[model samples]
Target: ATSTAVFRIGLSDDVEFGLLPPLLRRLRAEAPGIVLVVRRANYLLMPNLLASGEISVGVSYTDELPANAKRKTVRRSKPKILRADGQLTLDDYCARPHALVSFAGDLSGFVDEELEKFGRKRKVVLAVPQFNGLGTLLAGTDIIATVPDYAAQALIAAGGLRAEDPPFETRAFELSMAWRGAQDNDPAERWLRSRISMFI
Candidate 1:
């Protein structure tokens, strides 16, 4: 019987930005017969998608995964402060209105949580679901964003953005590959996971 294997993968927005392109190119060159389908998703949805067989693998920040899920650590990343118009001084960071990346579309985010520890908070003028939109949104405005260092670097390299150390302490996060328990021995799944791990 003739058949083709297809792998469906879900990726958090930030991971997609930093890892997807290289991964896709590698897959094309090394696994041409294996079809790859990728979906942009938030971390909260990863477990459900894996459990339901909607995706074969997921890439996201490790802290976001449920404790029970099977996962492999890929890398750790620090957060960087991003701005467009000028230097991101401590005062400017606190005084300027900000744009935050929140999967739930809420004003409060990790940055806000960290800010609360210092008894300070920035005004969240906008909340967006993905970091992809941040570059454009920040270009013509004074909104500042806190994002993964890699994503911030990409934005800065692409123009219309600048990155600096956060005025206050912000924790780093691990990126990982997650999958359902049943996929542990699946050859195709294992191969896909290995490929992703190698790329990241």
Candidate 2:
């Protein structure tokens, strides 16, 4: 009774970079018949993306979710300073041009609010919609990107950059994978969910 199915997954850029390889490997090895599709979605976009059936499953820093959906926590981490340089001071972190991973293309987020606690602010010279290419963007430049520890670790593991603690304390966020409860009774969907959980 099984048939080939189109499976779509939406995820934030950082998750795509760090989690995709192993995930793809597992799916290919275990279920080569399913058509796999991936989409770019940030937390703000996930609820609609899920509701409209744009994606069967999603992974990111989750916000609110459709009542018919369920989620699993992947990791909760504080922000880190990602750069090509060896170190940063509080003032140095502020003075440098910065790159921000803004889902809605805005210039600020929780990081900005944290800095505002003491009247401090960092100049956001670049606003990127995703985290996939952040490593390449910061390799030969002075621009710094503030990101989660897992993403920083992933980029650092890729070799050219280094991740350090933010010069100031910052906010932390939860990264999770969410799915529609409507798919809860489908074996194919269950396999997909289990595969993702195993790989992540």
Report lDDT per candidate: 0.77, 0.81
The global Cα lDDT (0 to 1) of model 1 is 0.77
Give the worst 10-residue stretch by lDDT in candidate 2: 166-175
Q: Which regions in candidate 2 have their CA more than 4 angstroms from the true location? A: 1-3, 117-119, 157-159, 168-171
As a TM-score, model 1 comes out at 0.87
lDDT at residue 63 of model 2 (Cα atoms)? 84
Best by TM-score: 1
lDDT of 1 by residue, 1-200 (tens): 12258889998888888668888888878866777788877767777777777887898765455444598878775888887774566777889998878456567777777778778878988878877768788887877888888788778888877788888775544677898777788877788888889988
Residue pairs clashing in model 2 are none
| lDDT of candidate 2 over 1-200, digit per residue (tens) | 14478889997877787778878987887767778899988788877888889998998886879879998876666788888764788899889999888558788877788889879988888888777668788888999988877677788887888888887774345678898999888888888888888787
**Top-lDDT candidate index:** 2
Regions of model 1 farther than 4 Å from truth: 1-4, 63-68
Backbone collisions counted per model:
0, 0
